[PDB]
Design a protein around this nucleic acid. Structure first.
Lengths: 81, 90, 91, 941, 96, 78, 90, 90, 96
RNA sequence: AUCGGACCCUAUCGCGAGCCGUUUUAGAGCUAGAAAUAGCAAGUUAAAAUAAGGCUAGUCCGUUAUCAACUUGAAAAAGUGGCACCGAGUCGGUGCU
DNA sequence: TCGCGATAGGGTCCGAT
DNA sequence: GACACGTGCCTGGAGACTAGGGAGTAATCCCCTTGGCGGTTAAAACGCGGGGGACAGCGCGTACGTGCGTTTAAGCGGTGCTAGAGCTGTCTACGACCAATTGAGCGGCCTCGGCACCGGATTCTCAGGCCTGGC
DNA sequence: CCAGGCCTGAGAATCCGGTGCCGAGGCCGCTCAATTGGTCGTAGACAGCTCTAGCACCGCTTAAACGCACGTACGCGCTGTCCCCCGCGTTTTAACCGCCAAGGGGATTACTCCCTAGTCTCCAGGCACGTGTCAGA
C-alpha cells in the first residue's frame, strides 16, 4: 500500500471542507489537510498500538483506542472509557 | 457494566413520550463514565491536597463546583443537598 | 453558491461519514504495521477512528475558516491551517 | 571507454571526463580526516584556477638596480680610500660623521654638523654656498688652496651622480656643439664647466621669482598667499618644496592663481615651465658624463698644485669616474654567480684599474655571446653566424633548388623574385673567411676585434684591417659547418634533378642521414615563452597525470586541448604525447592509445550559437569549466564523424550535419543540457606561498605604531620611519598565551601572519620565532603552515578563501540554470523580443535567485537592500539595460575578493572580510592540486 | 425499601457507584453520603441532557432518541458546551 | 480597580509578547481577557480555600487550580 | 525603539506588572467571591506570574494573526479571534 | 520534601563547572514532582485498564514510552532497563 | 541502601514511599520505583545538561531559572513535553 | 600540420647605464605670543639607504620558476583515498567491499 | 627612463616531409 | 430489525455488627498578614506631531467552481476458516505487614564569597577610505 | 585591477577594575524516614481450551471518482487615500520600600468520638436473552 492518504479521495476531503463550511477549497489545501491528517493518524496510531502491546495481546481493541484518544486529549463517546 | 436501566428510568421520568436507541444508550453510558472519572479524580486529588484521606460529600460538591459552569453547578449543588438530606432522613 | 449551500445542507443534515471506508481501513492497517506487524484490528475501532478523525478535521477546518474570515479572504490557504494548529498547539 | 577534454586559459584550466556515450562519469572519492562524511561522489569535470604567472621582468629590474647601487657604493668607497691619505690630516671624524649623518643626534656618535662639526662654519658654508654647485664653481674657477673637505664633497657629488655614457669619447661643449643648446643657456667661456654656471642660473631664477611671487601674493591676494604657502597638502609652493608635489601639478595649481592675479613675467615663465625648479629634475638625466669628466679634470688642475696625493692619484680618480663595465662582460662575479660568465686572469679583487689586466675581455665576451642557441638538428653543434659565406651558399642553393656565378657572385641582390644576397662577399673582395665572419659577429669591442684579427693581420693591408674594424655583423643562422658539410657539393651540381636540401636531410641513401639518426620541470623551463603560460602548461600536465591516477593507469581514449589567442598549443600537445604515450611497439613507434585533438574556438562558438550555449564571462567561473566538456564533446563528436578530420568548401561547411534544420540529435544534446544543468563543477584554486617584494616599495614618515618594519636594524621604525609588508603563508599557532592583567596562559589556536621577511627566520628556527612572539607550549607537530588561497567551507556551503591572516576571500560560485543564461543572452541581443516578453518573469526569477543566494552565502545586508531598492525603482526601465545591470551585478558574490559595482549608477562598495574567527571553526580543507582528493579537518584538536 | 437510592428518592444505584469508587482506589476510606451526592449529580446531569435530547427530538420529528440527538443538544447549550467542548460524540454530526 | 494594571504595564506585556504597535482598544480588551481569566482562576482558588476551611490563600492552592484549568507553571513550591 | 524594547523585555526575566496594584486587584476580586480571605505574598506573586504567563501566551498568537491577515501590528479582533481559535473564550 | 541535594549531585555528574540558583532549584523540584505525578498517574490508569492490580515495571515502561516522546526516552528506558538489571544486580 | 543497591543517585526509597502513599495503585512491583527513579534521573540529567551549557553560553556559572526556560523551550522534544508548563521567571524564548 | 631563407612586426630573456622619487638627519628661522597667537623670514641643497640582510665575502647574491598532506627522502621521485548502476541546486542513492 | 646582445613568435612570400 | 417488556435466576447491593483511627474540636502560641505611615521616585499619564500604519477600489490574472463526460474500486455480499481474545483453573514470586535498626537527611544557622553593578577603558573590526615606484 | 595593511573614522562590541551584598554553603544538632530480616496469601503468570470474530477473498454494480473545458468570480498588487498610535517632552502619582503593631488565624497538639472498612448474611434488582411489534429508509 502506498499513498492511501492520497488514496483518501479528494472529493471526500471536499465533503469534509464543505462540512467545515469553507467557501473556497483548493488542491493546496487538499494536500496540506492530507499531511495534517497523516500526522494526527501517526500520533494516535503510535499511542494506540503502544497500549495494544501493553495489553499483552495481539489484536487491537476499541477500548484501547478510547484510552489513546484520552491520552491525546480528545476523549471519545459510544464505547465506554 | 452499564448505567442502562437507570438511564431508561430517568428518561421515562423526564421524557415518557420518548424512546432511546442502543447507540444513544452507549453514548449516555460513556458520558456518565467520563463525568464519573472526572469528578472522582478531582475529588481524590483534592482529598490528597487536604492531606485527609476520607471522602466526605463536601469534596464532591467543591469538585463539581470546580467542573461545571456556575449556575448549572448551583443546580447540581441543590440536587445534591436534596439527595443527602433525604438519605439522612432515610 | 446556489448548489454550494445545498451541499452544505446535505452535509449538516446527515451523520454519514464523508470518507469511504476502504481508503481508511487500508491506511490505518498500513500505519499500524509500520510500528509493529503481526497486529490485528477491531473493525469497530476503525470506525471510531474514522469518526474521531473526521471531527478533528471539522474543527481544524472551522478554525481555518475563522482565520480566512479575519483575512477578508473567502478562499482559505494552507498557511491558515498551519497557523490554527500552531495556535491550537498541535505539533 | 573515456576521453578527456582540456581548455587551458591564462588563469583557468578546465578539464572534463566523458564516456563513449558523451556522458561525464561521476566518481565516489573517500574523504579523509576526522569529519562526519567520509566519502562523496563528484562529477569528473572541473577547473584549476591559479594566480597568473608573474613575469620575471620586475625581478630583473630590481636586480639591475641592486647591482648599480652596489657599484656606486663601491665607487664612493674607492674615492674615500683615495682621499683618506690626507683626510687623516684633516681629521678622521669627518667621514664617520658623514656616515652618521642619517642618524639622529640622540643616537649620533658625533656632532650634528657633517662638514665642520660646528654651527658657525656650517652656516657660513651654506650662506656662501647654498648648493654644492656653488662650491663647485668656486673650485673650478678659482685656483686658491681649498679645504680638503670641500674638494672631497665636490668630487663625491660629481661621482655619485656622474651621468650617462650615451655618446662615446669626450667632448668640450661650447654653446657637434648642437647637443647642449637647451639646458646650459650660459656662456661657456667664463668657466670650462658650464654645468655649474647653468645650475646656479637656475638657482637665481628660482630665487628672484620666489621673491617676486611672494611679494605679489602678499599684495594682490594675501589670504591666498597664507592659505597656499602655509600648508603643503594643497600641493602649492610649500607642497612643492616639502610635500610630495610633482612640479607639474604645482604648475597646474599655480596657473589659476597667476591668471586670477594681475604677473606677466611669472606667467610666461610658467608657460616656459622654467620659473621655479628643484635643482634636481626628472629630465636632467640627459646630462652626459663627459662634462663631469672635464670639470673634474679642470678642478684637479686648479687644486692639485697644493695637495700631492691628488696629483698622484689623478689618473686613479679619472678612471674611477670614467670607467664603466663593458656590457658584453655582464656580471663581475668570481665564478660564484648563476648569472656570471666573466673570466678573470688574476684572482685578486677587481678594481677600477686592474680590470684591464685581471679580466680577459675577449673570453668573457665570447662566453656571453655563446650562451644564443645552438644547432637545432644537433644541439651540441653551435649555430653559424647569420652572414656566414657557407651559410650564404646554403641559402642561395636552397632558393636555387628549382633552377648565378655571373649574377650572385658579383651583384648584391639578384632579381628575376628571390631572397638571397652575396653582397657581403662583394664587400670583402674559405676556412679563414668563416673565421673572419665569426670574429666579426662574435665580438663587438673595436680593440677586442683588433686583437682577434691580429692573428691573421699579416695578410692583406692594415687599411683592410680598418675596414674589418668598421663593419660588424649581427645575428645567427641555424646550422653548423659540419652539419652543412657533401651536401653543398651536390647542391652545386646534382646532375639532372637538383635535390632540395631538406630532401638530402631526408635522403637515406647517403651517410648524412645516418649521422642524422644520432626531466619534466627542467625541460618545460627550457622552453621558450612567457613564464605564465609555462606555469599553466606545467599545471595542466600535472592535472592530466592526476586524472590518469584517478583512472588507476587506465589510459583515456581522446585528449582535447584548447587555448585562446599556434605553436604553444602544439608544444602542449607534444609534451602530453611524450609523457602520456610511454609504450612503444616492436617497430619503435609511439602508439596513441589516447588520440590527440586540437580544436579551434570559433567552431565551438558557432556550435554554442546554433544550440543556445552562449558563454558569458561575467557568470561565475563554472561557465569556463563547462567549455572543457564542450571542448571534449564536439571534438569527440568530430573525430568519430570523420577519420580524415582526426588525421587533421566542406571544411568551411563542416557544421552542415550538426543541424537537423557518431552523433545523436536527442541523446547528445540532452546530455549537454544536463551537464550545463548540474551545479557542482570542480573549480579548484591553486594554493602556494607568496613570492614577491617584502613590502610596498614606498617608505613612510615616523610614527608611534608597531605596524612599521624598520628599514634598517638599528634605525627605530617609530623614529627613523621605514614597511607595510605583504604576508606569505600563515602559521597556525596553537599554544597558550598571556591574557588579561594577570596574563593567564590561555589556549589560543589562531592565524599568525608570516611575511616573506619572516620566512627565513621561521624556517631556520620555528620555535625561537614563535617564542619571540610570546607563544608558550610550542607544539611543533601541531605547527601548521597555511599557504595562501586555501579553501574553507561554512555550513550552508558558504566558502572562505584563505587570503590573509586577518582577511578572507569569496570561494562560492552560484551555478546558474542554463535557461537563465540563454534568456540573458537574448536580452543582451524578432524571436528575441518575444522570448524576452515571455521571460520577463524569468528575469524576475533570476534576480530573486541571485538575491536569495546572496542572503544565504554572502550575508551582506546593506548593499543587498540598496541594490534591491534600486531594482524596484528601475524595474520599469528597459529589459535589455536591466539585463546589462544584472550582468554587472553577477560579481556581487563571484569568486575572490569582493569588488565595487554600479547597479545603474549607484556604486556598491566591496564588503571586505576582516576577521578570521569563523575560519577557526570551519573545516580546514587540504586538497590535491586537481581537487578530486580531499582531506578536511576542523581546527579544534 | 431496600435500595438506598429509593430511600433517598434517587434513581442511580448508590451501591454501584460506591463499588466503582472503591475499585478506583481514590482512597482507602470513602464516606457514605459521598456516593449519594455523586448519584445526585449524575441524575441531574443525565436528566438535563435527556430533557434537551427529547425536546430536540420533538424538534426533529423523532419519538426515540438517536445518538446524534445528544450531540445536537450539547452543541445547542453553551453551558454544557464549555463542559464537553473537546468531547467527540460518535455519529454526532457537524455543529448545526 | 482593574486599572491597577495600567496601560504602560499592558504595553510592557505586549512588547514582551513582541507586539509591534498597540492600539488603544487593545489595552481594555486585554483587560477584559485577563479579567475573566483571573475571575475563573481565583474562583477555583477560593473554592479550594473554602474546602481547606482556612481563610488565607496558599500558593500551592493556586498551583492546584492552575493545574486543573490545564495551564501549569513550575516552581512556586509545587 | 520597539525592537530594542522587545529585545530588552524578551531577555529580561523580571515581571512586568508591578506588585502592589495587582495585589489590591486580587484582593478586590476575592471580595467578589468571599469576604475576609487572606493572600500570602507568595500566593499573590504566584497569581501574578501565572497571569503574565497567560498574557504572553495570548500575545504570541496576537502577533501570529497579523501575517496571515497580511496585517501589520495588532487589532482587538485578532485577540478575540485567537481566543475563539483556542476555544477558551466562551 | 525536596530533592535539592539529589539534583545538585546529578548536576555535578553532568556539569561540574556550573552553579544553580535557589529559584532554579525550586523550579526543578516542581518539575520532578510534576513529571513524577503525570507518569505515576498514567501507570495507575494503565494498571486499572488492563485489570492489573499491581504496578510492576513493564507497564510503567509502557507509560514512559507513551508519555515521553524522547527519541532517547527508550535510551532512558534503557537506563531504566540498565537500572532494572542493576537492581537485578542487587 | 536501596538506592545504593541500585547505585543510582535518585531517592529510590522516597519514590517507593511516594507511589505507595499516593495510592496510584494498590500494589507496586519492587523494580517499579527503581525504574521511575531511573527515568526521572535521565530526564533531569537531560535538563541539567541543557541548563549548564546554556549557562556557560550566558557567561554565568550559576543557573537562574531563565536557563531552564531557554533550554527546555529551545529543545523541540522538551518543548512538546513541557508544552503546558510555564517556568517561573522564565521570560519568553528569544523568538523574533 | 612542418622546413631554411627573405621582408615587416612583436614578445621574452640576459647585461651594462643613468635620473627622479621617497624617509631620516645637516641647512642656527626671527621676533613679539612665556603658552596656544600672529605676522615676518627663508624655503633650491647635502649625506646614507633604496627590499631585513646572507655567505660563497664576490665591485656576488636575496621578489623568476616550483610548492595539498603523510611516508620513503637531502633532493629527486614514487605511493598513499575503490568498482559498477540509477538520479542532480554544488552533489543525492544502491550493491561487493 | 637610455644603451647592447640573444631567443621566440605572428604573417606573408621564395623553394619541400 | 431494533426496542421495550416479559422472564428466570444469582451475586452484588443492602441491613446489621464490630472496632478503630481519621477527623472534628477545642485550646495555645506565634507568625505572616494587613494596615497604615512616612519619605522618596521612577513610572504613569497627558499631550503633540508625524509617519508609517490603515484601508478600500479596481483591475487583472488566475485558480477554483461548475458543468460534462469518463473511470473506477467501495459497498454489498456471498463465502469459510482460524487467531488469538478470552475464560477458567492451578502454581507461585512477591509485596505487604510486622518488628528492629540505623543514621542519614532536613531546617536553622551564620559567614563569606560569588557573582553583580558599573563607569571607564579596550579590543578589534569593519566597511568604507586610502594607497600602493616610476622616468 | 586588486586586494592587503592599516588606519582611520568611528564605533561595535568587549572587557573588566573596582566594589559590595546577599544567597551559597557549610556546620549544629537532631529522628523520622529509609533500610533490612522474616513471614502469608495473594496477583498474576501462565497453560489449556475455545470459539468467536477478524482475517481472507473476490467480483457485480455504480455512484462517486477522476479528468477536463470553461468562466466566473476571487486573491492581491497597486495605487490612492485617510489618520490613528508611537516616540517623546513634560508633569503627576501612587509605586517603592522600610518599620512596626497585632491578632486572626494557621500550625501544632491532645481529647474525644463517630463513621467507615471489614465481616456476616440476607435476598431480590438486575443481568442477558427471547418475543412481539412498531418506527423506519
Amino acid at each position: 500500500l502506498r499513498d492511501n492518504i492520497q488514496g483518501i479521495t479528494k472529493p471526500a476531503i471536499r465533503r469534509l471542507a464543505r462540512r467545515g463550511g469553507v467557501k473556497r477549497i483548493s488542491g493546496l489545501i487538499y494536500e496540506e489537510t492530507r499531511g495534517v491528517l497523516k500526522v494526527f493518524l501517526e500520533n494516535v496510531i503510535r499511542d494506540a498500538v503502544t497500549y495494544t502491546e501493553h495489553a499483552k495481546r495481539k489484536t487491537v481493541t476499541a477500548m484501547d483506542v478510547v484510552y489513546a484518544l484520552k491520552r491525546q486529549g480528545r476523549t471519545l463517546y459510544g464505547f465506554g472509557g | 457494566e452499564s448505567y442502562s436501566i437507570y438511564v431508561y428510568k430517568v428518561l421515562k421520568q423526564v421524557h415518557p413520550d420518548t424512546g432511546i436507541s442502543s447507540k444513544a444508550m452507549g453514548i449516555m453510558n460513556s458520558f456518565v463514565n467520563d463525568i464519573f472519572e472526572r469528578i472522582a479524580g478531582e475529588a481524590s486529588r483534592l482529598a490528597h491536597y487536604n492531606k485527609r484521606s476520607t471522602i466526605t460529600s463536601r469534596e464532591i460538591q467543591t469538585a463539581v463546583r470546580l467542573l461545571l459552569p456556575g449556575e448549572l453547578a448551583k443546580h447540581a449543588v441543590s440536587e445534591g443537598t436534596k439527595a443527602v438530606t433525604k438519605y439522612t432522613s432515610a | 453558491g446556489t448548489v454550494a449551500l445545498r451541499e452544505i445542507r446535505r452535509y449538516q443534515k446527515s451523520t454519514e461519514l464523508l470518507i469511504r471506508k476502504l481508503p481508511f481501513q487500508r491506511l490505518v492497517r498500513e500505519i499500524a504495521q509500520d510500528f509493529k506487524t503481526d497486529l490485528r484490528f477491531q473493525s469497530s475501532a476503525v470506525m471510531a477512528l474514522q469518526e474521531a478523525c473526521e471531527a478533528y478535521l471539522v474543527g481544524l477546518f472551522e478554525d481555518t475558516n475563522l482565520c480566512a474570515i479575519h483575512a477578508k479572504r473567502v478562499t482559505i490557504m494552507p498557511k491558515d491551517i498551519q497557523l490554527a494548529r500552531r495556535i491550537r498547539g498541535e505539533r | 571507454k573515456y576521453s578527456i577534454g582540456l581548455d587551458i586559459g591564462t588563469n583557468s584550466v578546465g578539464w572534463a571526463v566523458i564516456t563513449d556515450e558523451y556522458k561525464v562519469p561521476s566518481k565516489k572519492f573517500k574523504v579523509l580526516g576526522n569529519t562526519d562524511r567520509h566519502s562523496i561522489k563528484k562529477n569528473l569535470i572541473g577547473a584549476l584556477l591559479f594566480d597568473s604567472g608573474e613575469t620575471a621582468e620586475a625581478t630583473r629590474l630590481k636586480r639591475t638596480a641592486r647591482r648599480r647601487y652596489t657599484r656606486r657604493k663601491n665607487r664612493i668607497c674607492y674615492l674615500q680610500e683615495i682621499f683618506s691619505n690626507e683626510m687623516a690630516k684633516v681629521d678622521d671624524s669627518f667621514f664617520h660623521r658623514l656616515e652618521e649623518s642619517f642618524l639622529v643626534e640622540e643616537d649620533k656618535k658625533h656632532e650634528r654638523h657633517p662638514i665642520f662639526g660646528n654651527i658657525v662654519d656650517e652656516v657660513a658654508y651654506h650662506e656662501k654656498y647654498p648648493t654644492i654647485y656653488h662650491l663647485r664653481k668656486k673650485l673650478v674657477d678659482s685656483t686658491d688652496k681649498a679645504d680638503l673637505r670641500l674638494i672631497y664633497l665636490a668630487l663625491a657629488h660629481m661621482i655619485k651622480f656622474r651621468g650617462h655614457f650615451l655618446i662615446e669619447g669626450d667632448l668640450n661643449p661650447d654653446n657637434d656643439a648642437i647637443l647642449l643648446s637647451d639646458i646650459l643657456r650660459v656662456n661657456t667661456e667664463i668657466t670650462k664647466a658650464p654645468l655649474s654656471a647653468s645650475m646656479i642660473k637656475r638657482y637665481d631664477e628660482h630665487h628672484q621669482d620666489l621673491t617676486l611671487l611672494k611679494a605679489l601674493v602678499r599684495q594682490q591676494l594675501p589670504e591666498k598667499y597664507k592659505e597656499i604657502f602655509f600648508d603643503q597638502s594643497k600641493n602649492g609652493y610649500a607642497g612643492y618644496i616639502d610635500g610630495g608635489a610633482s612640479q607639474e601639478e604645482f604648475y597646474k595649481f599655480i596657473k589659476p592663481i597667476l591668471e586670477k592675479m594681475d604677473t606677466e613675467e611669472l606667467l610666461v615663465k610658467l608657460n616656459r615651465e622654467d620659473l621655479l625648479r628643484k635643482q634636481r629634475t626628472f629630465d636632467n638625466g640627459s646630462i652626459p658624463h663627459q662634462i663631469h669628466l672635464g670639470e673634474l679634470h679642470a678642478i684637479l688642475r686648479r687644486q692639485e698644485d697644493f695637495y700631492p696625493f691628488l696629483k698622484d692619484n689623478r689618473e686613479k680618480i679619472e678612471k674611477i669616474l670614467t670607467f664603466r663595465i663593458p656590457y658584453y662582460v655582464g656580471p663581475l662575479a668570481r665564478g660564484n654567480s648563476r648569472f656570471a660568465w666573466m673570466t678573470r686572469k688574476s684572482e685578486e679583487t677587481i678594481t677600477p684599474w686592474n680590470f684591464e689586466e685581471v679580466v680577459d675581455k675577449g673570453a668573457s665576451a665570447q662566453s656571453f655571446i655563446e650562451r644564443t642557441n645552438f644547432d637545432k638538428n644537433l644541439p651540441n653543434e653551435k649555430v653559424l653566424p647569420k652572414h656566414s659565406l657557407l651559410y650564404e651558399y646554403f641559402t642561395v642553393y636552397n632558393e636555387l633548388t628549382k633552377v648565378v656565378d655571373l649574377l650572385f657572385k658579383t651583384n648584391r641582390k639578384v632579381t628575376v623574385r628571390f631572397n638571397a644576397s652575396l653582397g657581403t662577399y662583394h664587400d670583402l673582395l674559405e676556412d679563414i673567411l668563416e673565421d673572419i665572419v665569426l670574429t666579426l659577429t662574435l665580438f663587438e669591442d673595436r680593440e677586442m676585434i683588433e686583437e682577434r684579427l691580429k692573428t691573421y693581420a699579416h695578410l692583406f693591408d692594415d687599411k683592410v684591417m680598418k675596414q674589418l674594424k668598421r663593419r660588424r655583423y649581427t645575428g645567427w643562422g641555424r646550422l653548423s659547418r659540419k652539419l652543412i658539410n657533401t651536401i653543398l657539393d651536390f647542391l652545386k651540381s646534382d646532375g639532372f634533378a637538383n635535390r632540395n636540401f631538406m630532401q638530402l636531410i631526408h635522403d637515406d641513401s647517403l651517410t648524412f642521414k645516418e649521422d642524422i639518426q644520432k626531466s619534466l620541470h627542467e625541460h618545460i623551463a627550457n622552453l621558450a615563452g612567457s613564464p605564465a603560460i609555462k606555469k599553466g602548461i606545467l599545471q595542466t600536465v600535472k592535472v592530466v597525470d592526476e586524472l590518469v591516477k584517478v583512472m588507476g593507469r587506465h589510459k583515456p581514449e581522446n585528449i582535447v586541448i584548447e587555448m585562446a589567442r599556434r605553436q604553444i598549443t602544439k608544444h602542449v600537445a607534444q609534451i602530453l604525447d611524450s609523457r602520456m604515450n610511454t609504450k612503444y611497439d616492436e617497430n619503435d613507434k609511439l602508439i596513441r592509445e589516447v588520440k590527440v585533438i586540437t580544436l579551434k574556438s570559433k567552431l565551438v562558438s558557432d556550435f554554442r550559437k546554433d544550440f543556445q550555449f552562449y558563454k558569458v564571462r561575467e557568470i561565475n567561473n563554472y561557465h569556463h569549466a563547462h567549455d572543457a566538456y564542450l571542448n571534449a564533446v564536439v571534438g569527440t563528436a568530430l573525430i568519430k564523424k570523420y577519420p580524415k578530420l582526426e588525421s587533421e568548401f566542406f571544411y568551411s561547411n563542416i557544421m552542415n550535419f550538426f543541424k537537423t534544420e557518431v552523433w545523436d540529435k536527442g541523446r547528445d544534446f540532452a546530455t549537454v543540457r544536463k551537464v550545463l544543468s548540474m551545479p557542482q563543477v570542480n573549480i579548484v584554486k591553486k594554493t602556494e606561498v607568496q613570492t614577491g617584494g617584502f613590502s610596498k616599495e614606498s617608505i613612510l614618515p615616523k610614527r608611534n605604531s608597531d605596524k612599521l618594519i624598520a628599514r634598517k636594524k638599528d634605525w627605530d621604525p617609530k623614529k627613523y620611519g621605514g614597511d607595510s609588508p605583504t604576508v606569505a603563508y600563515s602559521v597556525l599557532v596553537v599554544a597558550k598565551v598571556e591574557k588579561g592583567k594577570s596574563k593567564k596562559l590561555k589556549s589560543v589556536k589562531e592565524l599568525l601572519g608570516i611575511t616573506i621577511m619572516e620566512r627565513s627566520s621561521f624556517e631556520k628556527n620555528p620555535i625561537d620565532f614563535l617564542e619571540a612572539k610570546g607563544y608558550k607550549e610550542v607544539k611543533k607537530d601541531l605547527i601548521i603552515k597555511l599557504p595562501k588561497y586555501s579553501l574553507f567551507e561554512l555550513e550552508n556551503g558558504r566558502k572562505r578563501m584563505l587570503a590573509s591572516a586577518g582577511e578572507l576571500q569569496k570561494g562560492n560560485e552560484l551555478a546558474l540554470p542554463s535557461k537563465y543564461v540563454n534568456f540573458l543572452y537574448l536580452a543582451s541581443h524578432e524571436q528575441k523580443q518575444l522570448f524576452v516578453e515571455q521571460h520577463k518573469h524569468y528575469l524576475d526569477e533570476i534576480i530573486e535567485q541571485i538575491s536569495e543566494f546572496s542572503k544565504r552565502v554572502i550575508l551582506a545586508d546593506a548593499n543587498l537592500d540598496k541594490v534591491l531598492s534600486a531594482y524596484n525603482k528601475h524595474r520599469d526601465k528597459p529589459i535589455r539595460e536591466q539585463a546589462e545591470n544584472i550582468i554587472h551585478l553577477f560579481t556581487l558574490t563571484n569568486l575572490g575578493a569582493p569588488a565595487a559595482f554600479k547597479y545603474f549608477d549607484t556604486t556598491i562598495d566591496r564588503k571586505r572580510y576582516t576577521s578570521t574567527k569563523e575560519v577557526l571553526d570551519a573545516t580546514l580543507i587540504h586538497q590535491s592540486i586537481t581537487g578530486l582528493y580531499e582531506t578536511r579537518i576542523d581546527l579544534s584538536q | 425499601a431496600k435500595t438506598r437510592s429509593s430511600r433517598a428518592g434517587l434513581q442511580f444505584p448508590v451501591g454501584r457507584v460506591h463499588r466503582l469508587l472503591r475499585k478506583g482506589n481514590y482512597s482507602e476510606r470513602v464516606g457514605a453520603g459521598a456516593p449519594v451526592y455523586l448519584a445526585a449529580v449524575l441524575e441531574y446531569l443525565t436528566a438535563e441532557i435527556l430533557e434537551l435530547a427529547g425536546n430536540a427530538a420533538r424538534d426533529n420529528k423523532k419519538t426515540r432518541i438517536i445518538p446524534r440527538h445528544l450531540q445536537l443538544a450539547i452543541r445547542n447549550d453553551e453551558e454544557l458546551n464549555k463542559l464537553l467542548g473537546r468531547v467527540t460524540i460518535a455519529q454526532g454530526g457537524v455543529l448545526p
